[PDB]
Amino acid sequence: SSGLVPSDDEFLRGKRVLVVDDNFISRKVATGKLKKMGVSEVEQCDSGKEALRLVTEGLTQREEQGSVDKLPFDYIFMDCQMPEMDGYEATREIRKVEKSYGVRTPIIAVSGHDPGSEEARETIQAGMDAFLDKSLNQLANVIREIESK
């Protein structure tokens, strides 16, 4: 399954995206798909803490410069299961950093399996926007749904 949490080679043109995944191969695969959809800029990192850092720094910079776009990333694809700080905790911390800027980055949970009851709960509590099977086959639909909302 894939959905909201309570060709296409120009599909993401104009867009800047962050891929977060502790697995080297998953990360490359995601960035590949996205580059194929015309993504203007893909950034990738290998942990929740790194993600947190890039987002924190990017929001501060954009605020300091009076940037037109205040979000450093139009979308973040967040792997759920990672050592140390998982995707839930990182997303929770990202939402807390965001409060002071009055913005909300779309964050899409990425996992190799459908969530159980506990993960599903964490999904909502963390403040993720959507959830995407790692095939990434539903990527464009999930983003359209986010955009409609």
Counting DSSP H helices and E strands in the chain, the numbers are 5, 6
User: How near is the Cβ of 47 to ligand BEF at its closest, in Å?
Assistant: 11
* Helical ranges in the chain per DSSP H: 24-36, 48-65, 87-98, 117-126, 139-148
**Binding map of ligand BEF across residues 22-61, x = CB under 6 A, - = no contact:** ----------------------------------------
Of 143, 118, 138, 144, residue with least CA distance to 1? 138
**Does residue 46 belong to the site contacting Mg ion (CB under 5 A)?**
no
* Rg from Cα positions in the chain: 14
DSSP 3-state assignment of 5? coil
Quote the least distance from Cβ 86 to ligand BEF, whole Å: 8
Shorter beta-carbon distance to Mg ion: residue 14 or 32:
32
Q: Which of 74, 79, 93, 129 binds Mg ion (CB under 5 A)?
A: 79
Interface positions with ligand BEF (CB under 6 A): 79-82, 110-112, 134
